Each structure stands twice: as structure tokens, then as C-alpha cells.
Amino acid sequence: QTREANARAAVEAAFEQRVGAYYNLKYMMSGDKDIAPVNAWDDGRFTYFKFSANADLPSIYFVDAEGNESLVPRTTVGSSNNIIAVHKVNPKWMIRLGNRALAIFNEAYDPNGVPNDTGTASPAVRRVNKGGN
């Protein structure tokens, strides 16, 4: 029981650490500028779109080579829930709210990326198999 508590304490610390990350800020946009984020970037694993306090949070979609859109899972982060972190890095995204549409372009797309050797969002936390079996 001592080992588990120390382990989860260290895990929480390692998550909140977030040290040694690379941020890509080369993002352009075109379309209906009234649903636009105030900031968009990514850290090589997730893509973040920060929205101002007075803006409605729109729906964000994944655009492939042919221009088709597909759903992508998202989590809402930030102190005031103003950041939407989608779980993928992609060259082009589409933001939709109602009948308005905005296109987001990743102008420094890294095809290689960084591998997820651990199983968690952090490189300093490992997901280990407990079930054994």
C-alpha cells in the first residue's frame, strides 16, 4: 500500500511536469473568422486551439488528403475550459459552428512526429500491464 501511494504521487508530479516539449506555432486560417481561435499550436502529439472567453466553443474536424472530414476525439483543457486539445496532429482541420466554417492549416507539418513509446501522453510516465494473465 505504501508503494501504490508513492507511485501515484510520482505519476501526478511527472504529468504536471511537462518538461522538454517542442511547440509548433505555424498555423494559418481562412474562412469565417468569427469562430476563430485566438491561438492554435501543437506539441507534437496533441493540437490545441485556444478560444476567447466570449466565444462559443465550436466543433473541430479532421480533414484528410481528399478533403473529407471525420470525427476526432477532443478534450477540453485550460483553466477556464478555453482550450480544446484534439488527440492528433494533422496538416488541415475544419472548424464548424452552425452554418459558419473556418479552415485551419498546419504550415509546418512534421510527418514523422515523435513516437509514443510509453503509452501515456507524457514521456516521463509509463503505462505498465497490471492484469498479468
Binding site: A7, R8, A10, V11, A13, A14, S70, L71, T118, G119, T120, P123, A124, V125, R126, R127, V128, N129, K130, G131
Partner: protein
């Protein structure tokens, strides 16, 4: 899931079309000396379509319940350096 739908037009209407056309041709030939179609349609008309979805198509699964991975994984920190 959705793809290309085959409605079986000929398998549903070809019996009736051919019956009517042969009946008209027979009438014309008999006149030139100088209902089966409805019953075929009643039988061939109700054929459900068939969907064809190719391989490699992209799809989704919309999780309908809560999935719980507490018993199979656990988290341990990787020590620095």
C-alpha cells in the same frame, strides 16, 4: 455503414417488362394477318437491396457505454535521466 446500393432493377421489373413486350408483339403479329405482367410483378417486386462497401473504408465506433481499464493497466513514473 453505407456504400453502393444495388436495387435490383432488372430482377424486379424485367419479368413484367418482357411479358408486356411479348404480349404486344404477339398482338401486333396476329393483327398483321391482313394479367401475366401484373402477376409477374406481384412476385418479383419485393426484393430488398444489397449494400456493397469496399475494403479499406474509414469508419467509426461510437462507444455506447463506459469502458473501464482499471484492472489491466497501471501507471508508474519513469525516473529522470
Amino acid at each position: 455503414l453505407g456504400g453502393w446500393i444495388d436495387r435490383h432493377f432488372w430482377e424486379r421489373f424485367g419479368g413484367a417488362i418482357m411479358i408486356s413486350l411479348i404480349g404486344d408483339l404477339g398482338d401486333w403479329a396476329s393483327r398483321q394477318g391482313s394479367s401475366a405482367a401484373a402477376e409477374a410483378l406481384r412476385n418479383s417486386i419485393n426484393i430488398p437491396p444489397t449494400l456493397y462497401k469496399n475494403q479499406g473504408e474509414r469508419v467509426n465506433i461510437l462507444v455506447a457505454r463506459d469502458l473501464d481499464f482499471s484492472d489491466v493497466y497501471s501507471l508508474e513514473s519513469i525516473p529522470t535521466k
